[PDB]
Amino acid sequence: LGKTRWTREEDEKLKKLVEQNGTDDWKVIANYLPNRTDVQCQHRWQKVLNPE
């Protein structure tokens, strides 16, 4: 099983998009990452990738 399982290769894309734009409207990032809805992008980042 692997419901919407994420991979490091994908995390790099999400990271780059977040660094480029920001943790603003996740809809923008989601638009650039098909399948990965704003919920997926937001969760994957704010809930895991958050260097702070």
Write up what this structure looks like.
The protein is mainly alpha-helical and 52 residues long. The chain has one domain (1-52): Orthogonal Bundle (Arc Repressor Mutant, subunit A), CATH 1.10.10. The protein contains three helices and no strands. Helix 2 (26-32) crosses helix 3 (38-46). The longest helix is centred in the first third of the chain and has 13 residues, at 8-20. The radius of gyration is 10 Å and the shape is globular. Binds to HIPK1. Interacts with HIPK2, MAF, MYBBP1A and NLK. This is Transcriptional activator Myb. Residues 26-49 bind DNA. It comes from Mus musculus (Mouse). It is found in: Nucleus.
Outline the fold blueprint.
Blueprint: H1 8-20, H2 26-32, H3 38-46
PDB class: dna binding protein
Keywords: protooncogene product, DNA binding protein
Assembly: monomeric
In CATH, the topology is named Arc Repressor Mutant, subunit A
Q: Work out the count of structural domains.
A: 1
Number of strands: 0
What is the straight-line distance between the termini?
Answer: 31 Å
CATH top level assignment: Mainly Alpha
Determine the structural class based on helices, strands and strand pairing.
Answer: mainly alpha
Shape: globular
User: What does the radius of gyration come to?
Assistant: 10 Å
Within CATH, the superfamily carries the name Homeodomain-like
Strand percentage lies at under 5%
Q: Helical region count? A: 3
* Helix-strand topology string: HHH
Function: Transcriptional activator; DNA-binding protein that specifically recognize the sequence 5'-YAAC[GT]G-3'. Plays an important role in the control of proliferation and differentiation of hematopoietic progenitor cells.
Protein name: Transcriptional activator Myb
Subcellular location: Nucleus
Subunit structure: Binds to HIPK1. Interacts with HIPK2, MAF, MYBBP1A and NLK.
